[PDB]
Amino acid sequence: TDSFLLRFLRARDFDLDLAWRLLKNYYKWRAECPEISADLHPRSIIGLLKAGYHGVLRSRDPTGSKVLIYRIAHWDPKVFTAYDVFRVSLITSELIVQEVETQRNGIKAIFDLEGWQFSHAFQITPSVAKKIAAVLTDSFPLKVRGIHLINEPVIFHAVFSMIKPFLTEKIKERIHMHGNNYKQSLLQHFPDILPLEYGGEEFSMEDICQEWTNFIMKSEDYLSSISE
Amino acid sequence: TDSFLLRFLRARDFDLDLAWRLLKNYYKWRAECPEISADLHPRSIIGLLKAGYHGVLRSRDPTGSKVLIYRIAHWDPKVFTAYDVFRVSLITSELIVQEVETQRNGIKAIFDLEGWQFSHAFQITPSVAKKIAAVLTDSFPLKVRGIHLINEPVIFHAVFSMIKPFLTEKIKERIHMHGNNYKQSLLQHFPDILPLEYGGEEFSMEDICQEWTNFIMKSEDYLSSISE
Amino acid sequence: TDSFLLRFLRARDFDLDLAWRLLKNYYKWRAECPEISADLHPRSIIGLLKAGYHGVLRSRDPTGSKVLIYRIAHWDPKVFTAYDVFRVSLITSELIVQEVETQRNGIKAIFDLEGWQFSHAFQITPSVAKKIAAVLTDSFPLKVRGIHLINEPVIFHAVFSMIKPFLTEKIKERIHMHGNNYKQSLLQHFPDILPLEYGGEEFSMEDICQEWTNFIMKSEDYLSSISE
Amino acid sequence: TDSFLLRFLRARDFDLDLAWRLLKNYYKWRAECPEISADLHPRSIIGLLKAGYHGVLRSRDPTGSKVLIYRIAHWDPKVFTAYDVFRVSLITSELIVQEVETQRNGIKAIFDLEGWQFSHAFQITPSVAKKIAAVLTDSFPLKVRGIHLINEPVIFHAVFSMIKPFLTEKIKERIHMHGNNYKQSLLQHFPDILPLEYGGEEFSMEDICQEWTNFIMKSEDYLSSISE
Ligand SMILES: Cc1c(C)c2c(c(C)c1O)CC[C@@](C)(CCC[C@H](C)CCC[C@H](C)CCCC(C)C)O2
Ligand SMILES: Cc1c(C)c2c(c(C)c1O)CC[C@@](C)(CCC[C@H](C)CCC[C@H](C)CCCC(C)C)O2
Ligand SMILES: Cc1c(C)c2c(c(C)c1O)CC[C@@](C)(CCC[C@H](C)CCC[C@H](C)CCCC(C)C)O2
Ligand SMILES: Cc1c(C)c2c(c(C)c1O)CC[C@@](C)(CCC[C@H](C)CCC[C@H](C)CCCC(C)C)O2
Ligand SMILES: [Cl-]
Ligand SMILES: [Cl-]
Ligand SMILES: [Cl-]
Ligand SMILES: [Cl-]
C-alpha cells in the first residue's frame, strides 16, 4: 500500500536523504506547534468552513496540481484565531496528500485577500509568520507549486514582509500578487476550472465550500487517527 | 576559402584562445545532444516549416545582423517535440553562419509567444533549458546580438526562470520583453524590414516562411554533410 | 571537405583537448623518426610488398574495423630493416585513415609470426620498441581496436617484453596471443572475411597482397604529397 | 592542399605548441594594427613601389632563403608614412610565405639606409618600433634568418636603439651592420645573386623593383582576399 513514507519520497523526487529530512521537520514542526497540530478534528473549525472561508476545486490545473481557495473576508478574527485558521489548511493538506496525483504534481493556493483588516494582521505574529514559511518550504510533504494572492490591500505587504525572510528563493519565485485586476492573469494560470466569482464559467464558491466542508466532516474519523 | 575555423575566430573577434574554447564547446554540445544535432536533414521538421513556425528576413537590421522570426503558435507540441523545434533553429543557424556578414554582425531573433500554452512548457525541461542557454552563450559560432520576445503571456516567465540562471550577464542585457503593445518598440529596433504582421510595410509572414522553407529544402545536401 | 583535423577529432570522439594532443604527438613522432616518416614513397619497400609481407582485407569485421594482415615470414631482415618494415605500416595507415568508416571504427591487425627468427628480433631495438608503442597508443589518428598474434614462437615473448612497458592498459587489453591452434579463436573475431590460409573460405593471401600492393603503387602520388 | 596552418607549423619546426602561439600573435598583431593590416590592396602603396623602394631577388641565397631589398632613399616621408611603408613589407611577406621553400628556409632582408634623414626617424615612434620587433620575432610565420644594414648613417643608431630592447637574442645575432664599405662582406653572404648596385654581375635594381611591382599588382586579388 501507499506507505506513510511514500508521500515524503515523492515530495522530494525519491531523494532518500532529502525525503528523510522532510520527515524529520514534519514531526518537529508538529511538536513545536501542538496548538495547531495536536487535534485535527474538524470540530474546532467547522464554523470557519460553514462561513465560507475555504474550498477546493474539483478539477486540477493544466499541470495536475490540486487548487485550493481561501477567502480572508470570511475569517472573523474575533471568533477564530490564526491557529484555528492555520488548522484548516493543515486539515486540508493532510487529506489531499493522500491523492497520488497530488503527491506528484503538488498544489497551488489562491488567497482572496479582499477585506483584509488590521484585525487580521494582529493575529500574524513573528512566530506565526515563521511557521507559515516552514510548511511552505520544508516541513510538510506537499510541493507548493504556486501561491496566488488577489485583491491584496496596501497594508498587507507589511505582513508578507514578516514571512519573506524565512522563505527559500524557489518558493519566492512561485508567489504571485495580482492586485484588483487579477481576472485576466489568474485565468491564464487556471483555465476552465475557476469558480464564477473569479472569472469562472460554471460553479460558485458557495457550492465549492459546501462540498469541501462535507468531505472534511466525512473524513473526521481519519483526521482523529493522525492526531497525537 | 572561408575555413571552418574562420567562423569561430570572427565570433570571438580573432581571440584564438576564446575561439578555441568555443570550438570545444561546439563539439561537446553536439555530442551531448545527438537527439538534436546528429541528423540535421530537414526531413524530420518539414512539417514545422510548412506550418509557418519559422522564417528569416531578407534585409538585415541597421547594424547588419540577420533577423530571425519564430511563431510559437504554429508549433503543435502534440506533433513535434522540443528537440524537433530546437533542430529547426540549429538548421537555420548552420546555414546563416556561412554568410561572412552574419559572422561579423551576429544575429537577432524575434519570438512571437502569442498562443504559448501549458502544452509548450512541459516540453521545456531543466535539461532543455540549459541547452538553450548553452547555444545562446558559448557553444555555437553565432553572436547573439539580441533576443526579442513579444506577446509573452504571464505563464511564460516561469519558463524563462529556468533559462536565466545559466545565462551570462551579456546575453541577459540583450533579451527584451515587449508584451502585447510591442509594435512601437519593435519598429525602433527593426526599421523598414519587419513583415506586415508586426508593423511592417511590404511582405507577409507566410511569404517569408515559404521562402526560408524552400531554402532549407534546397540546402538539404549540405545539411546532410555536417551530420554525424 | 574532410579536413586533416577531422581524422584526429574522430579518433578521440570529438574531444578537442585530446584530439589536439594526438595531433601534437603525430608531428612530434614524425620529427623524431625521419628514417621512417620522411619519405613515404613505396619505392623503398616495393620489394617487401611483392614478397607477400602485407595485405588488407576487402571486408570489415563485425564492428566495421579495417583488418590488416602481416606475415613476418616474408620479411627478409638481411634485405629490409625494421625501419623499412615500419614504413610499410605507416604507408598503409596513411591510406586507410582517409576512409571515414575506418576513422569511426578503427583498425585491427593480424600478425602471422610463423617463421620469426633471431634475425628479426635484433632489428627490434629498445628505440624501435618504444616507437611501436607510440603509434599503438597516442601518436597516430587510428583507433587500434585489436592486435592479434598467431603462431608466435616462444622466443618472441622477449621482444614483446620490450614493448609492453610503454603500452597503456587499454591497448594491452586488446592484444591477443593465439599460438599455433589459432583458427577457431581467430574465426570468432573475424567471421567470413579471413583468407584461405587462416580458416577463410574464398580468397587467398597472395591475391590480397597483390591487390593492396597495386593500391599502394597507385597511391604513390598522394604518399609523396604528405612527405616532408 | 597547403593549409593556412601549415605555414605556421613549418615556421616553428612542427612544434604544435609554438606554432599555435605564433598563430595567436599573428591575429593579435593584425588586430592591434589595422592601419597597416586591415587593407593589403597595393592601391595605397603603388607609388612607393614605382618609386623604387622595394624589390625581391629571383635567386635564393646559398641556404635557400628568399632575399628582400629595401632602399630607404626612395621613401619620401612627406608622401608616404611609416604605416604605408610597413604595409609594403607586410604585402610582400604575405606573398612569399606561399612558397614552400621560403617557409622552410626563411627570408633575409637587405636595407640600403643611404639617404636616411631626420625626416624618416620622426615616423619611427616607440609604438612603431615595437611593432617592427614583433614581426621580426614571433608575430608572423616567416623565419627571419638575417637582416643586413648597409650605408647606415651615424644618426640611425638612435632609431635602432628603440627596436633592440624588444628583440630576442636570436634575432639580434642575425642583424648585421656593414657601413659604407659593405660590398666585400655582403658578397660573402649573397654570392652571384646581388644586383649591379651592390656588387652584383647581371641585373639592376630598377629591373628587380619593376618585376616585383608587377607581381604585387598581379596578386591584387589575393591580397584583397586576406583583408579584414
Ligand atoms: C501544508 C500547507 C499549509 C499548512 C499551509 C499552506 C500551504 C500552501 C501548504 O502546502 C498555505 C496556508 C497556510 C500557511 C496557512 C496560513 C495561516 C494564516 C492564518 C493564513 C491567513 C493569513 C496569511 C498570512 C495569508 C497569506 C498566506 C500565504 C502567503 C501562504 O498553511
Ligand atoms: C545557435 C542558436 C540556436 C541553436 C538557438 C537560438 C539562437 C538565437 C541561436 O543563435 C534561439 C532558439 C534556440 C535556443 C531554440 C529554442 C528551442 C525551444 C524549443 C524554443 C521554444 C521555447 C523557447 C523557450 C522560447 C524562448 C527562446 C528564447 C528565450 C531564446 O536555438
Ligand atoms: C599507425 C599504426 C602503425 C604505424 C603500426 C601498427 C598499427 C596497428 C598502427 O595503427 C602495427 C605495426 C607497426 C607498429 C609496425 C611494426 C614494425 C615492426 C618492424 C613489426 C615487426 C615486428 C613487430 C614487433 C611484430 C609485433 C607488432 C605488434 C605487437 C603490433 O606500425
Ligand atoms: C614579416 C616581416 C615584416 C612585416 C617586416 C620585415 C621582415 C623582415 C619580416 O619578415 C622587415 C621590415 C618591416 C619591419 C617593415 C619596417 C617598417 C619601417 C617603416 C621600415 C623603415 C625604417 C626601419 C626602421 C629600417 C630598419 C628595419 C630593420 C631593422 C628590420 O616589416
Ligand atoms: Cl502574476
Ligand atoms: Cl524593449
Ligand atoms: Cl584470444
Ligand atoms: Cl657583418
Author numbering:
A (entry chain A), B (entry chain A), C (entry chain A), D (entry chain A): 48 to 275
Provide the authors' original text about this structure.
Retention of α-Tol in animals requires α-tocopherol transfer protein (α-TTP) in the liver, a cytosolic transporter of 32 kDa weight. α-TTP recognises and selectively extracts α-Tol from the endosomal fraction of the hepatocytes allowing for its transfer into the inner leaflet of the plasma membrane and eventually across the plasma membrane into the blood-stream. X-ray diffraction reveals a spheroidal nanoparticle formed by 24 α-TTP protomers of ≈17 nm diameter.
α-TTPS crystallised exclusively when starting from monodisperse solutions of monomeric α-TTP. α-TTPS can exist in different oxidation states; we obtained crystals in both the fully reduced and the fully oxidised states. X-ray diffraction patterns indicated that both crystals belong to the space group I432, with essentially identical unit-cell parameters a = 168.18 Å (reduced) and a = 168.26 Å (oxidised). α-TTPS is formed by 24 protomers, for a molecular mass of 0.76 MDa, assembled into a spheroidal shell reminiscent of a viral capsid. Inspection of the density map of the α-TTPS model revealed well defined density for α-Tol indicating that the protomers in the particle are bound to the ligand. The X-ray structural model of α-TTPS, for both redox states, has an external diameter of 16.8 nm consistent in size with measurements on α-TTPS particles from soluble preparations. The structure is further characterised by an apparently hollow cavity of 8.1 nm diameter. The trimeric interface is characterised by hydrophobic packing and further stabilised by salt bridges. At the very centre, the three W67 residues interact with each other in T-shape by van der Waals stacking.
